[PDB]
Every structure is written in C-alpha cells, then in structure tokens.
Design a protein around this ligand. Structure first.
Ligand SMILES: CN(CCOc1ccc(C[C@H](Nc2ccccc2C(=O)c2ccccc2)C(=O)O)cc1)c1ccccn1
Length: 253
C-alpha cells in the first residue's frame, strides 16, 4: 500500500541526511554559486596553495584513499538503517557491503561533479577535470570515467530523497557472489524497488520511465568498478612503497 511505501521513503531519506554530511543539495548550492565558494585547484602550485586555504599524483591518490575510507564508513552507517539489513546473516551483511560500497561511492561522487570537475574536502575545494587528467602514467586515468558517468547520471536530475532509496536498492542486491540466503535479501530489495518506483513517479511526474532509466544505470556502475580494480592493480606493482588502507583492500578480493 502506497502509504507504507511513502513512510519507508521518508525513513531512508531521514537516515541518509544523518549518515552523509555532504548531500547533493549542498554540493549543488556550492557548484552553482555566493556564501562559501570553493578554492579551485587546476594546476600544481594552486594545489600547493590548497592548504594555505583549506609527488603530486601520489598526494591526490592518498587523498582519494582517505575519502573512500570515510565514504565506506558513512555508507556502512547508512546500511544499518535499511529495515531488515541488520537481521540478515552476518556473512551476508558483510557480502552486501563488500560489493555494494563502490557502486554507491560512484553514484554519490556524481553528486559532487559537473562536467568541469569535482568538489573535494567537504566542498571547501574544487579540483578540475583537466588537471586530474594531466596526471602522470596511470594516475591520470582514474577519475575520467567517473566524470563520464556523472555527466550522464546527473542528466537524470535526481535529488537526495531519490538517491537515498536507489542507494538502498544497490546494497540489497542478492546477486552478489557468495550470498548464503539470497531470498530474504530479495524480499527487502523488492519492497525498496516498490518504494523507489512510487518515489520517482511522485517526485518526477513529467519524467517518463525514470525508474527504468535509473535501473539501467546499474550496469554503468558495475563497469567503473572493474576498470578501477585494474588501475589499482597496476599501481600496487608500480609503487611497491605505497599501501592501500586495510578497509579498502579487504573490500577488494
Ligand atoms: C570528496 N572527494 C572525492 C572522492 O573521490 C573519489 C574517487 C574515487 C573513489 C574510489 C576509491 N579509489 C581510490 C582509492 C585509493 C586511492 C585512490 C583512489 C582513486 O580515487 C584515485 C586514484 C588516483 C587518482 C585519483 C583518484 C576506492 O577504490 O576506494 C573514492 C573517492 C575528495 C575529498 C578529499 C580529497 C579527495 N577527494
């Protein structure tokens, strides 16, 4: 019944606001500004001005590494609020997070992107696309495909209350490898999808088949993950002196 699906949409949006400090609504108010504009990093010595105000490639790398660990933590916190998730088998909870976390991270990374760059340091800074692309060897190809995804994903014009449900749909997948009790996962996702469908029709009545278009976007996410794991493997063997944070490599197996 629609009333129960509305209250579940309200619950998830509420918990999303509580778990994710930098929302898309805030991200967009910073990107389209004049209260607190970001400091813009576009070359090497602007990057070096970027702590008088808020190698280089390695520096950026470990900066993203720190933020991803922080994102995993926020995502993990959000997961526990999805009704039914903490009642699943422990191994399955772990499995849903291990595989869901980077697809969520690229989804929400789009919230901080326009075609020209990405918000960093809680929105305090803005790093340009072209500067990320000019990085040496393998580092300069990490962010470009996420920019590509974001440009297209942001075309859907989703807002945070949309994203809160869609992110929950991602986590409760059920075709993740190694799941022990697929079926109670699928019964939750099914209710989520019902919530997402009603949420999209009410929030975007003019937007024909946004539900279908949003779900098709889940193949775009799966592909970014794969590219990324390959690039991460090239680096593990090029700079044997540099370490992936244990939360992150645990996820990567
Ligand atoms: C908010 N934000 C953007 C987050 O961007 C992300 C962009 C991508 C990711 C996924 C993340 N990838 C990395 C993990 C460890 C080290 C580097 C990376 C890459 O990301 C990378 C490598 C080389 C060059 C550029 C990126 C993951 O797999 O956990 C996570 C986050 C910030 C904030 C502060 C500093 C940098 N940004």
């Amino acid at each position: 019944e629609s009333a129960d699906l509305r209250a579940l949409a309200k619950h998830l949006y509420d918990s999303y606001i509580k778990s994710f400090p930098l929302t898309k609504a805030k991200a967009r108010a910073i990107l389209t500004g004049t209260d607190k504009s970001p400091f813009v990093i576009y070359d090497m010595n602007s990057l070096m001005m970027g702590e008088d105000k808020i190698e280089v490639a390695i520096r950026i790398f470990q900066g993203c590494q720190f933020r991803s660990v922080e994102a995993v933590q926020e995502i993990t916190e959000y997961a526990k609020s999805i009704p039914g998730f903490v009642n699943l088998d422990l191994n399955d909870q772990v499995t849903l997070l291990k595989y869901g976390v980077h697809e969520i991270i690229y989804t929400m990374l789009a919230s901080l992107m326009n075609k020209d760059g990405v918000l960093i340091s809680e929105g305090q800074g803005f790093m340009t696309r072209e500067f990320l692309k000019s990085l040496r060897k393998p580092f300069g190809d990490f962010m470009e495909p996420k920019f590509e995804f974001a440009v297209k994903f942001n075309a859907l014009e989703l807002d945070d209350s949309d994203l809160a449900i869609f992110i929950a749909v991602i986590i409760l997948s059920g075709d993740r490898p190694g799941l022990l009790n697929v079926k109670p996962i699928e019964d939750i996702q099914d209710n989520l999808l019902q919530a997402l469908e009603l949420q999209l029709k009410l929030n975007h009545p003019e937007s024909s088949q946004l539900f279908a278009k949003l779900l098709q976007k889940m193949t775009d996410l799966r592909q970014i993950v794969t590219e990324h794991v390959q690039l991460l493997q090239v680096i593990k063997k090029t700079e044997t002196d540099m370490s992936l944070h244990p939360l992150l490599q645990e996820i990567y197996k």
